[PDB]
Design a protein around this nucleic acid. Structure first.
Ligand code: MG
Ligand code: ZN
Ligand code: ZN
Ligand code: ZN
Lengths: 263, 45, 49, 113, 49, 49, 66, 61
RNA sequence: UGGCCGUUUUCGUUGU
């Protein structure tokens, strides 16, 4: 029964139309993929030494937000569950940065690109930092001046966007339905009239305005959701969608297993 | 055993709690200790 | 009653997180020409209280 | 200084089973479910469908306090079906609906590019 | 000998950042410890427009 | 302290005897007290700090 | 201080775009334009790059103790 | 007990691989204080990593 | 091998 109609696809942003599914389901999918998509991001920042004007905590934080290519994270076990003593390369991807400036003039600009992967459960395409392009320098982590050296020994792990907002693969989920308010679920504030004040949505042409003589439908329901996804780049939007669906599926499957096992 | 660093010339040295508190190399009277060696951690959160 | 709800993720993204510096103070004290106080790691046998 | 562990919002302690059922003796064929480590994301989805079923008399839940990660679901199917079966039936229904949606999206993305 | 330490305020935590060690006006040792930490907004803060 | 135990409670100034009451205990995280939004009037209190 | 990593509101990484914004401003393009060419539509992001203040250059202008 | 005031890590548990210091060692449940957070957590003696002359040594030091 | 000690008085600034 469920349908799908992608309107504009891309690496990051997906602008589709989902219809013929319970609004509860669309909302829960949005929520789960905003919150319950396992990913990879910096977890333990071990600073061998620092000489910058930025507090060590400040850098550890800035690293916490750096998006990590996590296309194979699904293979990586949870560091909580992995049986290895301390961390292992099958439950942890080690990245190290060691940048420096020399000379009495100018200012260096350490970027995300300078990050480097030391190990990782290869060849799983995990650990690499994301970039818009190849020459796109990217995220700015700091600025260095004469004699100032920065050295760090980062660590990442597999956590979920619940435990922090760095594990969020989703950036901004658009979401709406009934662009003409057929179901009337919203009452429109106004000073003179509803129609001559409120500008129309961008999906205005996608559903025909109600006819002037049209009367209310008390059995009507929400049917067509237009949800435009976007990502930081840590995972492809299609991967986001499929992984969210898979996670929700396995979660319900776990619940059903619990139900049956209880007896 | 207890290194230091000048605030004017930024050259490292040490003292044994008996030398007067002065920079050995430039004579400046403001110094700082240097970072320990045990390992520093952050959760990046 | 003038209370606010904050987007947890907005906090986690570096919203209104600030720094806090505290400076301690101390100095060696003199009770006379031959009596002073020395910064040092005190052993328990040599010191009391 | 007394904040809960952010890893505890989803991880479960060993001694507590993921789900806990409590029959509702004050009316017939009614049960109350004591969930663990769950919120609106799961509850709303389960409730919508279990309401859509024909042989369900009353179904509801509530989030006690957003500072705690568990909720309670009230379910009362007609005498025709025991509630456990209705809940697992809805579980299967959403499972298959999601599978269908995934397959359609996969095909659509393949063709689109 | 008697202890004359300068314990950290029991209600504070963080990391020592920058130790200073110079003479006072009168030529005794005269120290300063700038401990630091970052304050995460949480339940019970204050804000204003 | 365990849940449901009795403990006093107060605000300053304690103008009228409806500024002191005996409540019941509920253990919770975070480091603030919380009151049902109704009982603010007898304490003449608000959460602006 | 420094351009942040992720927009607090949404989460759309912006920090990497700061330099490009300065560059575009250089040739005199009006700010709204520059924010456009970066593809920043939701003003939840426009607020930052429009109204962030760079201090790290100021903080570095002091000679480090090293 | 000669096993106090030493740097210690966690090998298993919800804080796998966090540097911690032994603040209190009453018995059979070591109270260790971490660095990344501003808190101290109890933990069984066998779920920790103890620094030694070389490498990280489990509970045999 | 338990047992175990951290100023006052001013003034200020603020808070509800
Ligand atoms: Mg007030
Ligand atoms: Zn491992
Ligand atoms: Zn010098
Ligand atoms: Zn934004």
């Amino acid at each position: 029964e469920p349908k799908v109609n992608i309107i504009n696809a891309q690496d990051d942003e997906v602008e589709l139309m989902l219809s013929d599914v319970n609004l509860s389901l669309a909302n829960s999918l949005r929520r789960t993929m905003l919150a319950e998509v396992p990913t990879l991001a910096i977890d333990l920042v071990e600073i061998k030494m620092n000489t910058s004007v930025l507090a060590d905590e400040f850098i550890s934080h800035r690293l916490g937000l750096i998006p990590l290519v996590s296309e194979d994270v699904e293979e990586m076990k949870y560091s909580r569950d992995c049986t290895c003593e301390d961390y292992c390369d099958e439950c942890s991807v080690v990245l190290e940065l060691s940048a420096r400036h020399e000379g009495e003039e100018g200012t260096t600009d350490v970027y995300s690109s300078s990050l480097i992967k030391v190990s990782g459960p290869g060849n799983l395409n995990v650990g690499e930092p994301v970039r818009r392009d190849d020459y796109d320098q990217g995220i700015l982590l700091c600025k260095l001046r004469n004699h100032q050296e920065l050295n760090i020994r980062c660590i990442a792990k597999k956590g979920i966007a619940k435990e922090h907002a760095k594990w969020s693969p989703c950036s901004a989920i658009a979401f709406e339905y009934d662009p003409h308010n057929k179901l009337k679920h919203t009452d429109f504030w106004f000073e003179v009239d509803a129609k001559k004040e409120w500008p129309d949505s961008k999906y205005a042409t996608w559903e025909e305005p109600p006819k002037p003589g049209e009367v209310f439908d008390y059995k009507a329901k929400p049917n067509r959701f237009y949800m435009t996804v976007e990502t930081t780049g840590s995972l492809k939007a299609n991967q986001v969608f499929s992984r969210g669906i898979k996670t929700l599926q396995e979660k319900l499957a776990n619940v059903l297993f619990e139900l049956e096992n209880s007896r | 055993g207890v290194k230091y660093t000048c605030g004017a010339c930024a050259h490292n040295f040490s003292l044994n709690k008996s030398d007067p508190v002065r920079c050995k190399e430039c004579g400046h009277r403001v110094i700082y200790k240097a970072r320990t060696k045990r390992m520093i951690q952050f959760d990046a959160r | 009653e003038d209370s606010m709800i904050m987007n947890q993720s907005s906090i986690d993204r570096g919203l209104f997180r600030s720094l806090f510096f505290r400076s301690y103070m101390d100095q060696e004290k003199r009770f006379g020409i031959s009596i002073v106080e020395e910064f040092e790691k005190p052993t328990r046998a040599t010191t009391l209280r | 200084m007394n904040a809960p562990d952010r890893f505890e919002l989803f991880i479960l302690p060993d001694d507590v089973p993921k789900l806990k059922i409590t029959p509702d003796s004050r009316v017939p064929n009614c049960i109350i479910i004591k969930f663990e480590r769950e919120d609106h994301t799961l509850a709303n989805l389960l409730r919508e469908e279990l309401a859509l079923y024909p042989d369900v008399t009353f179904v509801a839940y509530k989030v006690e306090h957003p500072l705690f990660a568990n909720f309670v679901m009230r379910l009362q199917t007609e005498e025709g079906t025991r509630p456990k079966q209705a809940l697992e039936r809805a579980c299967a229904s959403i499972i298959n609906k999601l599978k269908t949606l995934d397959h359609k999206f996969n095909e659509e993305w393949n063709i689109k590019n | 000998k008697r202890d004359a330490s300068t314990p950290l305020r029991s209600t504070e935590n963080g990391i020592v950042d920058q130790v200073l060690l110079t003479t006072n006006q009168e030529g005794l040792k005269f120290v300063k410890v700038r401990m630091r930490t970052t304050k995460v907004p949480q339940i019970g803060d204050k804000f204003a427009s | 302290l365990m849940d449901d135990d009795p403990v006093l409670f107060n605000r300053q100034p304690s103008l009228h005897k409806m500024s002191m009451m005996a409540h019941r205990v509920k253990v919770m995280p975070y480091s603030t007290f919380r009151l049902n939004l109704s009982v603010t009037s007898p304490y003449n209190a608000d959460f602006d700090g | 201080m420094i351009i942040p990593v992720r927009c607090f509101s949404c989460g759309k990484v912006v920090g990497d775009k700061w330099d490009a914004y300065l560059r575009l401003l250089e040739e005199g393009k009006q700010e709204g334009d520059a924010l456009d060419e970066l593809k920043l539509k939701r003003y939840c992001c426009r607020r930052m790059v429009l109204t962030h203040v760079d201090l790290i250059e100021k903080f570095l202008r002091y000679n480090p103790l090293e | 007990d000669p096993t106090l005031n030493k740097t210690v890590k966690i090998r298993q548990g919800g804080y796998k691989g966090k540097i911690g210091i032994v603040k209190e060692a009453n018995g059979d449940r070591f109270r260790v204080e971490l660095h990344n957070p501003n808190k101290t957590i109890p933990i069984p003696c066998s779920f920790l990593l103890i620094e030694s002359t070389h490498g990280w040594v489990p509970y045999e030091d």
